[PDB]
């Protein structure tokens, strides 16, 4: 498709990029974990980062892989600074929300027709 790409060209400089800002996240999880005075096992903070970057795996295209970045490149602005107050962060790890069954026969006794 003819439209100018954003940053990358095909898939390599692109997949050099996603490798890159990983470390900015990987090098800085914990400085926050003492800064907000939020308490968690610092390794959790390194599981989620690696839990997300493995999530969107099937992407076939440039200008998508550049699009996601422009989001991801942002967040390091807010989080590495303090523009969030504890409660824009911890929302990643959902503490309160009761589990979903996701199995079959556990559904059939609770809830209609999902």
């Amino acid at each position: 498709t003819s439209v100018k790409p954003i940053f990358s060209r095909d898939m390599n400089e692109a997949k050099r990029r996603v490798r890159e800002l990983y470390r900015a996240w990987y090098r800085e999880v914990p400085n926050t974990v003492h800064l907000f005075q939020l308490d968690i096992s610092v390794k959790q903070g390194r599981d989620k980062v690696r839990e997300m970057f493995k999530k969107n795996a099937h992407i076939t295209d440039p200008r998508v892989v550049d699009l996601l970045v422009i989001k991801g490149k942002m967040e390091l602005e807010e989080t590495i600074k303090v523009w969030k107050q504890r409660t824009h962060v911890m929302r990643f790890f959902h503490e309160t929300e009761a589990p979903r069954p996701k199995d079959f026969l556990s559904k059939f006794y609770v809830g209609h027709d999902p």
């Binding site: 079959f104 006794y109 027709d113």
Partner: protein, 688 residues
Amino acid sequence: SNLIEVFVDGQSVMVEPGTTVLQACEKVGMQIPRFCYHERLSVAGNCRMCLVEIEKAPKVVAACAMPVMKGWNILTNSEKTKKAREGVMEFLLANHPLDCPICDQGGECDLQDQSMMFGSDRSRFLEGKRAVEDKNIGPLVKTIMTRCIQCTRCIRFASEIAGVDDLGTTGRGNDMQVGTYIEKMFMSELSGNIIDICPVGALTSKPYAFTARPWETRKTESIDVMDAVGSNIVVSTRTGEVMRILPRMHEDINEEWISDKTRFAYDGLKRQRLTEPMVRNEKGLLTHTTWEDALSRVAGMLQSFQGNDVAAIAGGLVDAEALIALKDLLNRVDSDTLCTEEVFPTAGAGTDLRSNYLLNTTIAGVEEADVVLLVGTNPRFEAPLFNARIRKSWLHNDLKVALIGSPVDLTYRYDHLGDSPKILQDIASGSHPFSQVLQEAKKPMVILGSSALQRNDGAAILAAVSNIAQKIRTSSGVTGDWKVMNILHRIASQVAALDLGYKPGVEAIQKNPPKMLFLLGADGGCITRQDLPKDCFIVYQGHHGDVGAPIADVILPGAAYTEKSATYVNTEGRAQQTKVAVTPPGLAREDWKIIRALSEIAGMTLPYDTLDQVRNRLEEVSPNLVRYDDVEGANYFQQASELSKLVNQQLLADPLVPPQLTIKDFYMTDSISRASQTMAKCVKAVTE
């Protein structure tokens, strides 16, 4: 080559020699406003709200009835037309009293969506307004005749399609009423369908009478199953409940018309209904138990029985997706001996190739047909839209009719040929005439029902009638192919419940004593507990409680026809999928999801979960149930014409009779009808 060009608003368009202005000016996308003109009816001239203005002639014509000659300039929008359509619709607001707060059509009416857009602004009268008086017809049509813009669209309809000729025009001058001179109540099928016709709020529906106004509802298309032709309906939902249902204007089945029974029967849907599972208890005790509890109660009891001792029979309106999950499950324990509640006599066919098993020439075939002979049925009260799809074609062009047995009241001039099974045979050669008339017929047709086919000699009449179809078809027999012999059912879901391969007729249980049955039938008085052996248990499954709710072991709920995305079939073998509307009440659940949670808690676990993994299974076991609404070319009754001649059985002797005669039994029949409390109002206004 036979067409005219005529310029509508300065634009050329082609029109067949003899279409009116209105059918031309529709082709380019305009509505001349309409009051007395309507497609499916005839045409008369007495609204005078379509005045088109022709080019270069001082008079103003009317665009309902008048042909269109070599090209006029048909000028819709000028300063001449706009001098009329403003000057009529200030007349018919002279007397139209000050309802609309409360006139129950107050959200659709056509003294409203004309007379803002087209026509006037304020009024100059200033004093007047006759008010006549109403009366009553029946416990459906509610009648305030104070309104009546007097299109005369309710009258040309009685003498037209539904053949009952009653309504009339009584009077002269400013005063003429409409309703009937004497006190006769006017009651029939399809004549509960008027209240689509009347363009203003004269005729408005009784049970619905005051509940909701029609900007609030939600139109979710659906399909009506109480009967063969199906429909295309549309439901409505206010708060999450059903309010009222319409037709959906399909172009073959339900021209614009929906029958009456399928309309006023939503009412027993929310009345008496079973909202939970109910355990067994040993006594007359029957109680409610948690959904996990009475599931296993019947789970283990399957690990006991085996072989033909466990057989299920489902004869009712059940879907075509709970006719697999139940078939594959009870057939993976290898116990079948299963049938439906219905009775289809079989000899050398009745499943294979089907060819005789469904109505061959579709509904849309009748329009072309020439000679018709139908036997052993009263087509009026079963498939009421196959009747008047004769009537309209009996008129509008010539058609001939003959019936066999028990002359009933139909709407058109037929003739009773003879009454007995023994008449059919002598018509093989010349006797008891037609003799050549079926023979000389260009497109003969023959229709056998499910009432006559259900006798104990049944496999004979199937084979006796097929002969006369072979008799003719082997000559030419039509032109041409033009299939002839065909059947019509009266039962909701059968052609699905059968051509899946479920053997016809309840016999296979009648020979032996199987211990554990599943009743989806379920309310026929066929199988009782007395007929069963000892108390070994039957598990009822279904939504209602009618008969077979008490006589049963453990029951399980279900969703009706408005709550589930299912697949039905009508008697041309289409596939129509009803669509979700309300979500089912209390604890009840869908049927084919109550199978798989019967399976996994027991031994075998069927190979699917979601819906699309049901229909792929529907796709293996049958190819055409996933082809929605297409009639594929099949004849294939040659090879079954001979093979069903195998058995030599001969008839009984006894005059044919239909179950339904004149009316009163039309209402309470299937399930929902029986519990519908408004039918309970119009059954006692019949007897007396």
